Amino acid sequence: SQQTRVLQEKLRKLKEAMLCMVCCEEEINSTFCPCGHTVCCESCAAQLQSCPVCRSRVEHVQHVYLPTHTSLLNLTVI
Amino acid sequence: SQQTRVLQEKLRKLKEAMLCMVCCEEEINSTFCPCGHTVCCESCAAQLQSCPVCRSRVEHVQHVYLPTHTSLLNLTVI
Ligand SMILES: [Zn+2]
Ligand SMILES: [Zn+2]
Ligand SMILES: [Zn+2]
Ligand SMILES: [Zn+2]
Numbered sequence: 001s002q003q004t005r006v007l008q009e010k011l012r013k014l015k016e017a018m019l020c021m022v023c024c025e026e027e028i029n030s031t032f033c034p035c036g037h038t039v040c041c042e043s044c045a046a047q048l049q050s051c052p053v054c055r056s057r058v059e060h061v062q063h064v065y066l067p068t069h070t071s072l073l074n075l076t077v078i
Numbered sequence: 079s080q081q082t083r084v085l086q087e088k089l090r091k092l093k094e095a096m097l098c099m100v101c102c103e104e105e106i107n108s109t110f111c112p113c114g115h116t117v118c119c120e121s122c123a124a125q126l127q128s129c130p131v132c133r134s135r136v137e138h139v140q141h142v143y144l145p146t147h148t149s150l151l152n153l154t155v156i
Contacts, residue, residue, distance in 0.1 A: 001079070001082065003082050004079065004081055004082050004085065007082065007085035007086065007089060007156070008085060010089060010149065010152055010153065010156075011085060011088060011089060011092075013148070013149060013152070014089075014092060014146060014149040017145050017146050017148060017149050018145065018146065021145075028145055031109055031140060031142050033140055034140075036140060036141040036142045036143050037142075037143055038116075038142045038143055038144060038145055039145055062109060062111055062112075062114060062140055063114040064109045064114040064115075064116045064142065065114050065115055065116055066116065066144070066145075066146070067095045067096060067099075067106055067116055067117055067144075068092055068095050068096060068146055070091070070092070070095060072088055072091055072092070073088070073092070
C-alpha cells in the first residue's frame with residue numbers, strides 16, 4: 001500500500017541518516033568538538049583535522065551514543 | 079495491516095527517541111561529556127549534575143547537531 005511504502009521509506013531514510021557520511025557503513029558515534037557536527041564514525045572522524053560540514057578546526061572528538069540506536073530497529077547495511 | 083501498524087510503532091518510538099527524554103518537547107541537541115549519552119536538549123541537560131542515563135558526573139555539555147534532523151522534520155506526521 002501507499003501507506004506502507006511511505007512509512008518504509010521514512011524508516012529507510014532514518015537508518016541511512018545514522019550512517020557515517022564518509023564510509024557509509026558504520027554508525028555515527030562521534031561528535032567533532034567544539035563545532036558539534038555529528039556525522040562520522042570514530043575511525044573516519046580520526047582522519048579529519050577540520051569538520052567536513054563546517055571546516056571548523058577539530059580540537060577533539062567526543063564519543064556519542066545516537067539516541068535512535070535501538071533494538072527496535074533492524075539496522076542492516078547492504 | 080500488521081506491518082503498517084508495526085512501522086507506525088517503530089517510527090513513533092524513533093520520533094520520541096529524537097526528542098529530549100526530560101521535557102519531551104525539543105529535539106535532542108546535546109551530549110553529556112565524558113560519557114557520551116545524547117538524550118537531552120541543552121536546556122534540560124544544563125540542569126543535570128549527573129547523566130540521566132548512566133549517572134556519570136557531567137563534566138561538560140557539548141552542543142550537537144544530530145544527523146537525523148531531516149527525519150524528525152518528516153515525522154511531524156507519521
Ligand atoms: Zn566512517
Ligand atoms: Zn562542524
Ligand atoms: Zn529538554
Ligand atoms: Zn551517560
